[PDB]
């Protein structure tokens, strides 16, 4: 048996003064997750490029919890549909960081990618990255994953650039709102919103304000 | 460079002056055929250096100019640097080659409009409001020639001044120009009449464009 006591007002309310209906309760999903004792506790993906965007390096930093052992390994593999395009494997124990050493519970994998398909709102090219925690010998402990889009965002000479070209933001602000269910969100509604946006020449959205 | 007495008068009455080297090669094809040619450098230098030597003590002179309508040659860059070195007390400007070259401290277009772009190949005239905010641009903008007063003219003059006031980096300009260049001729009764190009049997000519 679970018992949850939900307060309408708290000291948190002082920082939640958005121009919207003020409601309360458990308005998003509740779930239960099972992880091993030795587990993946965090992971970061980065993509950086050469000047013409014909070569990329994908960089993935992974962290673990549990007991540290020499047999432990991470493999990050990059997939495009059913084709594996790159892969890296390494033992834990990052670069030396200061006078006391490095993170023995962390590892960085770097994968080279030639002529990468780039992500933009015009053509949303995606790769699938799979992060496996395992033994030297190849026995899986667990796996996490995410979608990867190869893109660069930088400001130069006063212009916001995406993949080297100057952006033109056709954007809108969107609160999470439904007339019957209040501030509860569902997939059917979200998909309905995105289709209407794109059918009406919008290319960007702001999560106003949370 | 003007008659020496002009500088004296501007010191005393109070007027700001742009002092300009005797250099204009408008009719060359292309416009920088001479000013990019190192064989014409000594001839050009003497027209810039001797102006600076004669005039550098008048307070009314606040800006030096490398000439006009001669495109942009490497001779301009060398001479720009000569002035910046012997006299740091005054900004240097020059219009040729697109008004914003490496040979000018001040974006000095001629006949650039307030809101409307004129995007000529190689040497565009952007709207002055747009020009200040072009990626990576920081300099002030002061038109070296604007509002051409030929005949019944000066329409839309208010529009420049509304912009000059609203924009800190738009610091105004020099109307073209002060006085009609017409000459006197006489009829059979001795009555004088005002003449323009063509009226002396001079040909080819450009008719009323001198007024
Ligand atoms: Mg508000
Ligand atoms: Na101004
Ligand atoms: Na004229």
From Swiss-Prot, chain A:
The signal peptide, as residue positions, is none
Residues of the site described as Transition state stabilizer? 175, 209
* Chain residues that bind substrate: 19
Factors inducing expression: By allolactose.
The entry's Na(+)-binding residues are 19
What superkingdom heads the lineage? Answer: Bacteria
Task: Describe its assembly.
Answer: Homotetramer.
Question: Its family?
Answer: Belongs to the glycosyl hydrolase 2 family.
Official protein name in the record: Beta-galactosidase
Q: What organism does the record attribute this protein to?
A: Escherichia coli (strain K12)
Q: Which residues of the full protein are shown?
A: 184 to 393 of 1024
């Amino acid at each position: 048996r679970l018992a949850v006591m939900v307060l309408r007002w708290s000291d948190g309310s002082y920082l939640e003064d958005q121009d919207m209906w003020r409601m309360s309760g458990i308005f998003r999903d509740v779930s239960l997750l099972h992880k091993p004792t030795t587990q993946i506790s965090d992971f970061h993906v980065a993509t950086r490029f050469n000047d013409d965007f014909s070569r990329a390096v994908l960089e993935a930093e992974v962290q673990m919890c549990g007991e540290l052992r020499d047999y432990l390994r991470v493999t990050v593999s990059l997939w495009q549909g059913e084709t594996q395009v790159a892969s890296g494997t390494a033992p834990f124990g990052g670069e030396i960081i200061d006078e006391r050493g490095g993170y023995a519970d962390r590892v960085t994998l770097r994968l080279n990618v030639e002529n990468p398909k780039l992500w933009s709102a015009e053509i949303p090219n995606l790769y699938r990255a799979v992060v496996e925690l395992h033994t030297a010998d190849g026995t899986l402990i667990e796996a996490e994953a995410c979608d990867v889009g190869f893109r660069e965002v930088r400001i130069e000479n006063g212009l916001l650039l995406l993949n080297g070209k100057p952006l033109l933001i056709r954007g809108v602000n969107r609160h999470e709102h439904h007339p019957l269910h209040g501030q509860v969100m569902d997939e059917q509604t979200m998909v309905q919103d995105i289709l209407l946006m794109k059918q009406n020449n919008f290319n960007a959205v702001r999560c106003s304000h949370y | 460079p003007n008659h020496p007495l002009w500088y004296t008068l501007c010191d005393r009455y109070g007027l700001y002056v742009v002092d300009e080297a005797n250099i204009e090669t408008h009719g060359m094809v292309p416009m920088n055929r001479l000013t990019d040619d190192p064989r014409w450098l000594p001839a050009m230098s003497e027209r810039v250096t001797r102006m600076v030597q004669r005039d550098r003590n008048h307070p009314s002179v606040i800006i030096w100019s490398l000439g006009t309508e001669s495109g942009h040659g490497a001779n301009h860059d060398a001479l720009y640097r000569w002035i910046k070195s012997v006299d740091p007390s005054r900004p240097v400007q020059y219009e040729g080659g697109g008004a914003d070259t490496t040979a000018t401290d001040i974006i000095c277009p001629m006949y650039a409009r307030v809101d409307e772009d004129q995007p000529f190949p190689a040497v565009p005239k952007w709207s002055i409001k747009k020009w200040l905010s072009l990626p990576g641009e920081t300099r002030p903008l002061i038109l070296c020639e604007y509002a051409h007063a030929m005949g019944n003219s000066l329409g839309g003059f208010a529009k420049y001044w509304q912009a000059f006031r609203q924009y800190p980096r738009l610091q105004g300009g020099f109307v073209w120009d002060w006085v009609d260049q017409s000459l006197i001729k006489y009829d059979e009764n001795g009555n004088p009449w005002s003449a323009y190009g063509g009226d002396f049997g001079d040909t080819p000519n450009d008719r009323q464009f001198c007024m």
